[PDB]
Amino acid sequence: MPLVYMNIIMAFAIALAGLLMYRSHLMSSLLCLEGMMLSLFIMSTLIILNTHFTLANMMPIILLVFAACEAALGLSLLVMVSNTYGTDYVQNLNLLQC
Amino acid sequence: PFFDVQKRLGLDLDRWMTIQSAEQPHKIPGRCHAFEKEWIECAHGIGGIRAEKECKIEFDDFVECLLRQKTMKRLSAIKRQRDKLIKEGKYTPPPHHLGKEDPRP
Amino acid sequence: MTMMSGRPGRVPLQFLPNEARSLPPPKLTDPRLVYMGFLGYCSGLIDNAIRRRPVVSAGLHRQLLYVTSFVFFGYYLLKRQDYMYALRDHDMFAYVKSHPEDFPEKDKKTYGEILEEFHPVR
Amino acid sequence: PGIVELPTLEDLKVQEVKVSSSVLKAAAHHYGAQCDKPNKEFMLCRWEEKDPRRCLEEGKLVNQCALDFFRQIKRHCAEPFTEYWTCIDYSGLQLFRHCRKQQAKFDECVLDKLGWVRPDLGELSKVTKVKTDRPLPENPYHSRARPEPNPEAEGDLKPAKHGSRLFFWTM
Amino acid sequence: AGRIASFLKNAWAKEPVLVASFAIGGLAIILPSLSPYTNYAIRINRATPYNYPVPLRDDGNMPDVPSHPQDPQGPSLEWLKNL
Amino acid sequence: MNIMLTLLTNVTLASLLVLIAFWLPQLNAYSEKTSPYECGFDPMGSARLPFSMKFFLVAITFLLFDLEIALLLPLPWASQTNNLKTMLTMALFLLILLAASLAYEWTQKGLEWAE
Amino acid sequence: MNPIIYTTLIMTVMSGTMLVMISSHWLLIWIGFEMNLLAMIPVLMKNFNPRATEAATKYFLTQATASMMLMMAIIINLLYSGQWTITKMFNPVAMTMMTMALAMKLGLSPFHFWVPEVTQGISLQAGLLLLTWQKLAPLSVLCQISQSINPNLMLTMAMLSILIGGWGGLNQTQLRKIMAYSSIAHMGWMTAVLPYNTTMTILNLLIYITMTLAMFMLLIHSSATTTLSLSHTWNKMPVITSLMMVTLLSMGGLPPLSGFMPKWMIIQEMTKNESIIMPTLMAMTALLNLYFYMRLAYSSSLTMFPSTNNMKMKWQFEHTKQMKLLPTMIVLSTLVLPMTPALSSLN
Amino acid sequence: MTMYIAFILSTIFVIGFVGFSSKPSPIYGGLGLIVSGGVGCGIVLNFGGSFLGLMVFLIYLGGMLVVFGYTTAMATEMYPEVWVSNKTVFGAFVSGLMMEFCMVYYALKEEEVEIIFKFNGLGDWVIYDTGDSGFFSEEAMGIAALYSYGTWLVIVTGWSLLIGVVVIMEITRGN
Amino acid sequence: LFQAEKDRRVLQMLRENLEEEAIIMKDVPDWKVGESVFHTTRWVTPMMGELYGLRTNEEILSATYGFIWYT
Ligand SMILES: CCCCCCCCCCCCCCCCCC(=O)OC[C@H](COP(=O)([O-])OCC(O)COP(=O)([O-])OC[C@@H](COC(=O)CCCCCCCCCCCCCCCCC)OC(=O)CCCCCCCCCCCCCCCCC)OC(=O)CCCCCCCCCCCCCCCCC
Numbered sequence A: 001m002p003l004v005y006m007n008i009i010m011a012f013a014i015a016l017a018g019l020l021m022y023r024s025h026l027m028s029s030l031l032c033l034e035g036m037m038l039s040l041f042i043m044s045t046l047i048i049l050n051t052h053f054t055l056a057n058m059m060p061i062i063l064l065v066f067a068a069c070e071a072a073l074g075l076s077l078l079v080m081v082s083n084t085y086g087t088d089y090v091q092n093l094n095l096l097q098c
Numbered sequence B: 001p002f003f004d005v006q007k008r009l010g011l012d013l014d015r016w017m018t019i020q021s022a023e024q025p026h027k028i029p030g031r032c033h034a035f036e037k038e039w040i041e042c043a044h045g046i047g048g049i050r051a052e053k054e055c056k057i058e059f060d061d062f063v064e065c066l067l068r069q070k071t072m073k074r075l076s077a078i079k080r081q082r083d084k085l086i087k088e089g090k091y092t093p094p095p096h097h098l099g100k101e102d103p104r105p
Numbered sequence C: 001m002t003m004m005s006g007r008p009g010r011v012p013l014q015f016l017p018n019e020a021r022s023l024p025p026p027k028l029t030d031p032r033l034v035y036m037g038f039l040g041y042c043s044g045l046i047d048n049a050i051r052r053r054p055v056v057s058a059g060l061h062r063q064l065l066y067v068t069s070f071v072f073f074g075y076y077l078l079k080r081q082d083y084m085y086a087l088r089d090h091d092m093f094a095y096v097k098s099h100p101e102d103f104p105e106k107d108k109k110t111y112g113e114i115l116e117e118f119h120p121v122r
Numbered sequence D: 001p002g003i004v005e006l007p008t009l010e011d012l013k014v015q016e017v018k019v020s021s022s023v024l025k026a027a028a029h030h031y032g033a034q035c036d037k038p039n040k041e042f043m044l045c046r047w048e049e050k051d052p053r054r055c056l057e058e059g060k061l062v063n064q065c066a067l068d069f070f071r072q073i074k075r076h077c078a079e080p081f082t083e084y085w086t087c088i089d090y091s092g093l094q095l096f097r098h099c100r101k102q103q104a105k106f107d108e109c110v111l112d113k114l115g116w117v118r119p120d121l122g123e124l125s126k127v128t129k130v131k132t133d134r135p136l137p138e139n140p141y142h143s144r145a146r147p148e149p150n151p152e153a154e155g156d157l158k159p160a161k162h163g164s165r166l167f168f169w170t171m
Numbered sequence E: 001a002g003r004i005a006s007f008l009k010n011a012w013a014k015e016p017v018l019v020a021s022f023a024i025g026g027l028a029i030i031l032p033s034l035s036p037y038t039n040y041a042i043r044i045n046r047a048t049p050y051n052y053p054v055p056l057r058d059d060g061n062m063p064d065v066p067s068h069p070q071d072p073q074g075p076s077l078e079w080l081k082n083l
Numbered sequence F: 001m002n003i004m005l006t007l008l009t010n011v012t013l014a015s016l017l018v019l020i021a022f023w024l025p026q027l028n029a030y031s032e033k034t035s036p037y038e039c040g041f042d043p044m045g046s047a048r049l050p051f052s053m054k055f056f057l058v059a060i061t062f063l064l065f066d067l068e069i070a071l072l073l074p075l076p077w078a079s080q081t082n083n084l085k086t087m088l089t090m091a092l093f094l095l096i097l098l099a100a101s102l103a104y105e106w107t108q109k110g111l112e113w114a115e
Numbered sequence G: 001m002n003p004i005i006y007t008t009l010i011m012t013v014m015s016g017t018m019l020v021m022i023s024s025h026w027l028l029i030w031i032g033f034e035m036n037l038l039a040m041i042p043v044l045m046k047n048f049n050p051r052a053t054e055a056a057t058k059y060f061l062t063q064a065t066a067s068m069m070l071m072m073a074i075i076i077n078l079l080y081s082g083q084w085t086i087t088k089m090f091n092p093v094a095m096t097m098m099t100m101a102l103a104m105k106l107g108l109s110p111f112h113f114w115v116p117e118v119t120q121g122i123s124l125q126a127g128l129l130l131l132t133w134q135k136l137a138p139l140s141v142l143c144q145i146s147q148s149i150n151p152n153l154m155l156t157m158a159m160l161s162i163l164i165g166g167w168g169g170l171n172q173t174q175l176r177k178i179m180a181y182s183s184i185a186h187m188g189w190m191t192a193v194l195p196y197n198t199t200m201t202i203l204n205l206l207i208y209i210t211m212t213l214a215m216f217m218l219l220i221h222s223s224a225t226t227t228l229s230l231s232h233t234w235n236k237m238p239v240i241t242s243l244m245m246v247t248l249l250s251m252g253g254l255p256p257l258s259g260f261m262p263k264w265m266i267i268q269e270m271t272k273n274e275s276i277i278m279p280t281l282m283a284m285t286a287l288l289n290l291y292f293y294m295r296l297a298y299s300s301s302l303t304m305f306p307s308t309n310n311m312k313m314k315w316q317f318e319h320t321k322q323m324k325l326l327p328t329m330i331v332l333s334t335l336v337l338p339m340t341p342a343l344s345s346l347n
Numbered sequence H: 001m002t003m004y005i006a007f008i009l010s011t012i013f014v015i016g017f018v019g020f021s022s023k024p025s026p027i028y029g030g031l032g033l034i035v036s037g038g039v040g041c042g043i044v045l046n047f048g049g050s051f052l053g054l055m056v057f058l059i060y061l062g063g064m065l066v067v068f069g070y071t072t073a074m075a076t077e078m079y080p081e082v083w084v085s086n087k088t089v090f091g092a093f094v095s096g097l098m099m100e101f102c103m104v105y106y107a108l109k110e111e112e113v114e115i116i117f118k119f120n121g122l123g124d125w126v127i128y129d130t131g132d133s134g135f136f137s138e139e140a141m142g143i144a145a146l147y148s149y150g151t152w153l154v155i156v157t158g159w160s161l162l163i164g165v166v167v168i169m170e171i172t173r174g175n
Numbered sequence I: 001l002f003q004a005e006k007d008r009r010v011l012q013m014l015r016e017n018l019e020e021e022a023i024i025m026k027d028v029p030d031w032k033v034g035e036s037v038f039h040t041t042r043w044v045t046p047m048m049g050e051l052y053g054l055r056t057n058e059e060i061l062s063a064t065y066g067f068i069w070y071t
């Protein structure tokens, strides 16, 4: 595994860690999710191109689709909670406990 | 769990994309078509447990083709020994390894 | 781990292979079938109880359908269970026959030659 | 796990065909029409052996046949051929469609100088047969012996002895 | 018979763009199944030699396969030149 | 290589123009001159307050409709395949489904802005 | 929500689950997971209030993160072996990430935090769907890769799930949180035996599903979501409370009821692999679940709580909507133990 | 080793990921994600996948636009945070940069294994093919095979998109 | 013709690399010169690290990125 594969894996790990830590905004976490999606796309594309897996070339494109379907979902949710609180702070999501 | 509707009906919903040696468009071959074909032929019909131990040679060759780790190690050793021989100066690499070669078609 | 899902020659979604026709079918007076009919009768009684109806005599057609459906499902369930157990025994005996070195027939001593330690209770 | 057999540099020596891409493209059709036989043996050897080290002589014969083809073209009429391939070389994509008059002149020269006929559209893509004395390889993949499969399921089916044998159940 | 006619007139009077778009979409859906040139398009796509044609080994009983490209045997592209 | 040189040249020329703009003239900056502009009077609030978007649902739909162009872009290469019937059927199916998505968004009053 | 839209969303969820369980390609399984989550999100938000919206947001975040690590594990397995088929995961790191992602998808501890919140925030029908149907796809995926699962990590998570569910269910007065903690404990029980025998996993899942269906359908019949609200049911329909107490007894694992059958079948299996400490700890920990079932049984059926005057009016009206499958679910959740050997039909 | 192009691009990709992963005001996070998308697109073209990189870049530029549009509405934060405007953001950014530099140095000078395996450098040019054939683009042919081989994929993806439109409209309904 | 010339060129580059490796690794403890890496004995396409590993940088850049960078 050359430096490129390790750098892409590190990018995915950084995006996942940034998602797992919440500061205030939900939009920043959605941005981290988009970053994870981009890192996965890049790694899959590199792996498929390196081995000349011809059919698998359609795999990353499909990977993109369910990307924004996940994004369009989150943004949608981000609207509604805002309509309840006037802000997208994840602090306000504390009505339900363990 | 796994309800094999594809095998029951012969539908082939996603079995065309599972391996790289299976009917690529314009007959374009994978980088490791021979290795994967050999390993699949070795491991066919003997179960996972038996294939993990008896087809280990073909799988090792396939992984070597896929990642080329041992080849990179060999090349790194070659270039390190070449650098050590050049630093003290008793190698003098040949002219065709420096750009003074008479190329062929 | 799964033991019989990868058995060679297995049809994916058959639920009753043709070889299962070689085994005797369960008798209609099987105690398990009677228990399934009892389960259907209890289901009918509970259905009558929930809807605030006379429990024992509200719907005779409904109770009869309950019992009949339970018995009908139980017949094929018992057939499949018996077939699976027969398959297990068949595979076990075949493996034992095919690997004599792993199941050695050992000559067995009589109790007169074995020395068991005696532990008095006092 | 073994040393790799590589031919010596003397076995790789051959008289190279030193014409440029445009020159080859201009005479490509007549070359495929005239030098088809050694080319087809070489291609069949290459695809059957899957090893460049087992078909070097066929490549040498291909080079020799190409040399004879170009030597005949040079000997009989080379001026129309030069006028055609300079035109082919001018185009950035080396388009046949830009120079049909030079192609016509070259075709008419080769038709009466050597009896050569330019192949029609679709003929050069045909799948042809090869008569060869080279034995068909038996194990081109160098495959090992395949493992013996699990034996079989044989015999008739009998009911389980004493039923399920699960704890206290007698059925 | 008459309800569809009045509906279409009202749609053309109010929303010509939707009528034109639906007509174009319906034509694009229906026409290819009723055209004789789809087979010609398929054959033209099939006749393009993207990769090398690997020659066959003569076992002595292949009359249909040619021995040289200019032999009359094999597929012919005569229909393409006259189309 | 060539494209990298082109991008470098363009960015360098733009940055040089910025440098000439910010280093050639004589600048006299004071507090009143650098204040925000709201047509002569001081702004009431901050320009970093929330700004309601009445077309948010169309913005969400634009993401999926942008994915559909990514799906439909390889059509020129797809039209070269042998299975023209299946290729045409699948392309028409995808376009029909996207048209149905647009129709469902239209009829459910989804293309109309909030008030 | 429009009934046609609700039906097509439900069918899209079930189609995603079906695609997960019928696919031999990892990409198709991932696509099925994405479809299931996408169609599942609006079902949780069927009734609009701040609490339902919050639950959907937490569920979306959790499932999205689990999907991301699922996809990265797939990509790593592809990198170290050019295989797309679902198989024994030639790379251990990819196997670990897949185990973690499926653990969060199921809700195994310590990824259990979202389950009580999501269950409490949504309605009873959405809770039933979440606690019954959403468990099929991850467990179906796990049953295929069990030969490569590291026993230590899976068993640690199963023990943690059992302990955490038993401890959490003790402090709850809301019924949906109790159901969520019971689901966590039962998830631990399912996943404890998975590396050894997947047939026991399937049997445990089926029994848990039937008991959860009976429980949730009884809770829907008597519109109670708290302990005190359920304490009023004895004065309106005693039979519902009696069947509820029998079902709670079955869930606790007391013989000869059905809930004893899976545990009994799991422990035995674990004793064939020289595993004695783990089954003993699991059996001892199930007593906490039994205790917080018994507290509910005491509150609702074995004692009569004070009632209210207006309840008299409710005596004049009947349950208009009938659930056909409820008696069958109750019977299958209580009286099934004598038919234990039928589990041989599951392999 | 040669021209450092792939290595520099991957490093900038990681830097942009750290930049938007420190979670400043979402404007700068979107900027960092845009630059990361462009850099990854260039990385992909450096391996022969021009269409995938352009497509990824093209998809991302517009997704971010929608994200900027939503940030200006619901995540405004009257004092927006930049990487140097807050101690937590700067700490996370510096930690990510320092960790990336240490990993690069450890895997470059020596052969260190972090999680999966080790790396010795040599440049990514070593693992290429030398395959010399083709009058078409292999990546383009593979992507175009979606409409002949991937009928199931097209069906499921189109259904997912239609369901997504229905789902977002149901979610944003409110009431 | 192109196939034949490519085969000869690849074999020549491999043989030149082998004849050099016989010289750099004369005095390494246990190096087998020309030893293969795969267990199988069939032909394996070179990796472009085995053909240009001991050559100047500009040939490496050509053989790696010439087609991609040619515009
Ligand atoms: C190992 C072997 C064992 C296997 C075990 C397998 C698993 C075991 C069971 C798993 C757990 C079951 C959990 C199910 C709970 C369902 C959740 C729910 O809906 O609410 C709960 C529900 C709600 O109660 P509620 O409060 O009274 O309802 C209020 C209303 O819902 C208030 O809402 P509303 O006002 O809007 O009312 C609308 C209402 C009324 O609905 C209507 O209005 C009807 C109008 C129709 C509209 C037409 C639209 C269609 C056009 C769209 C086309 C989309 C195509 C999608 C496909 C895309 C493909 C890519 O619709 C509904 O209520 C729900 C509709 C349900 C339809 C289900 C259709 C099945 C989908 C199957 C898909 C799979 C296909 C293959 C995929 C291939 C792969 C790609 O409560 C119950 O239903 C009682 C529980 C009963 C559950 C079933 C019990 C267990 C199952 C036993 C059956 C046999 C199983 C074994 C079969 C093996 C093969 C023979």
Ligand SMILES: CCCCCCCCCCCCCCCCC[C@@H](O)O[C@H](CO[C@H](O)CCCCCCCCCCCCCCC)COP(=O)(O)OCC[N+](C)(C)C
Binding pocket: B001, B002, B003, B004, C002, C005, C011, C012, C013, C014, C015, C039, C077, G203, G206, G207, G210, G332, G333, G336, G339, G340, G341, G342, G343, G344, G345, G346, G347
């Ligand atoms: C509370 C008890 C559980 C309740 C169960 C639900 C009750 C209704 C029964 C469900 C009806 C459907 C069953 C038959 C329809 C078709 C069956 C066929 O299509 O599927 C077969 C499979 O059929 C099932 O295996 C049998 C289902 C029967 C369920 C009953 C067993 C319950 C365990 C013992 C409890 C006693 C129950 C008594 C009932 C009163 C194919 O086998 P296969 O595709 O290769 O297996 C896939 C999984 N593998 C490969 C991983 C193994």
Ligand SMILES: CCCCCCCCCCCCCCCCC[C@@H](O)O[C@H](CO[C@H](O)CCCCCCCCCCCCCCC)COP(=O)(O)OCC[N+](C)(C)C
Binding pocket: F016, F017, F019, F020, F023, F024, F025, F026, F027
């Ligand atoms: C068209 C696109 C391509 C253009 C190609 C030409 C590139 C143009 C050059 C880039 C911008 C130049 C702007 C032209 C005006 C000069 C601005 C600057 O260079 O002068 C001063 C820079 O000098 C500083 O005052 C400090 C000078 C000394 C301190 C460090 C310099 C050390 C260098 C050694 C010099 C000694 C002799 C060297 C001989 C080679 C800044 O003074 P300041 O008032 O703020 O800014 C306003 C300038 N005003 C006055 C004209 C309005």
Ligand SMILES: CCCCCCCCCCCCCCCCC[C@@H](O)O[C@H](CO[C@H](O)CCCCCCCCCCCCCCC)COP(=O)(O)OCC[N+](C)(C)C
Binding pocket: B013, B023, F083, F085, F086, F089, F090, F093, H148, H149, H151, H152, H155, H159
């Ligand atoms: C049996 C179950 C029936 C009821 C359940 C329905 C739920 C499933 C959804 C629809 C099922 C149909 C999918 C069938 C699999 C498609 C693949 C197979 O059928 O062949 C394809 C045939 O596909 C054809 O285009 C016709 C079928 C496509 C139907 C159009 C889509 C309709 C789907 C509607 C339901 C989906 C959800 C709702 C969306 C609106 C192409 O094969 P072919 O090209 O020969 O050879 C390929 C191999 N090559 C490349 C080497 C040559």
Ligand SMILES: CCCCCCCC/C=C\CCCCCCCC(=O)O[C@H](COC(=O)CCCCCCC/C=C/CCCCCCCC)COP(=O)(O)OCCN
Binding pocket: E008, E011, E015, E018, E019, E020, E021, E022, E023, E024, E025, E026, E027, E029, F096, F099, F100, F102, F103, F106, F107
């Ligand atoms: C078989 C082919 C189908 C597939 C191809 C379709 C191609 C894509 C075209 C459709 C894209 C999406 C269409 C969205 C539908 C819009 C629904 C709608 O709400 O339209 C109404 C209008 O109502 C309508 O639906 C339009 C009229 C009916 C539809 C158009 C005509 C239907 C088809 C007619 C052509 C048939 C074929 C040609 C026959 C030629 C004559 C013999 C809009 O009005 P408002 O915006 O609310 O106005 C507010 C301000 N006053």
